[PDB]
Amino acid sequence: GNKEKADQQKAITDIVALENALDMYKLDNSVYPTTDQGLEALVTKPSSPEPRNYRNGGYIKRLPKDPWGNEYQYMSPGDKGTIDIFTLGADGQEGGEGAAADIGNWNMQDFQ
Ligand SMILES: [Ca+2]
């Protein structure tokens, strides 16, 4: 339970940080990065379509990986909201309970 708890807390903290970074990107550029541009758009200026007011040196120094060693997932346009930011949990797959549960910007509150 304890390590499970710590991992889920880290995931939540990471998603909040990423969402904050994404909001800063939109504040500067008027749009969010697309799915294809990805979270990598927060670290270096993306292409296709290239933003027109990109902050010198990006919006985050590096992308965190999730507690299970996997890259956070990102969709814009999202399925659960305007942008979806999530981890598929311990199992690296959709659905699951306990440490395998998916944690995203749309359901963080449940793990809180
Ligand atoms: Ca899962």
C-alpha neighbours within 13 Å on the C-beta side of residue 36: 4
Instruction: Please give the distance of CA 75 from its chain centroid, rounded to a whole number.
Output: 9
Report the separation in Å between the CA atom of 28 and the middle of ligand 1, taken as the mean of its atom positions: 33
Resolution in A: 1.9
CB 102 within 8 A of CB 77: no
Report the separation in Å between the CA atom of 88 and the middle of ligand 1, taken as the mean of its atom positions: 4
Q: Is residue 57 part of a domain?
A: yes
Q: Is residue 74 part of a domain?
A: yes
What does DSSP assign to residue 24?
Answer: H
Say how many domains are in the chain.
Answer: 1
- The experimental method behind these coordinates is X-ray
H or E segment to which residue 6 belongs: helix 2-29
Tell me which residue range forms the domain holding 31: 1-106
User: What CATH number is attached to the domain comprising 13?
Assistant: 3.30.700.10
Q: Looking at the DSSP assignment, which residues form a beta bridge with residue 103?
A: 87
Question: DSSP string of 63-111?
Answer: PPBPTTS-BPEEESS-SSSSSEEEE-TTTTSS--SGGGS-EETTTGGGG
Q: Is residue 101 part of a domain?
A: yes
A 10 A CB-CB count for 41 gives: 25
Q: Looking at the DSSP assignment, which residues form a beta bridge with residue 74?
A: 85
For β-strands 73-75 and 84-87, DSSP reports them as antiparallel
CA angle at 48 for the pair 57 and 46, rounded to the nearest 5°: 15
The residue type at 75? M
Q: Is residue 111 part of a domain?
A: no
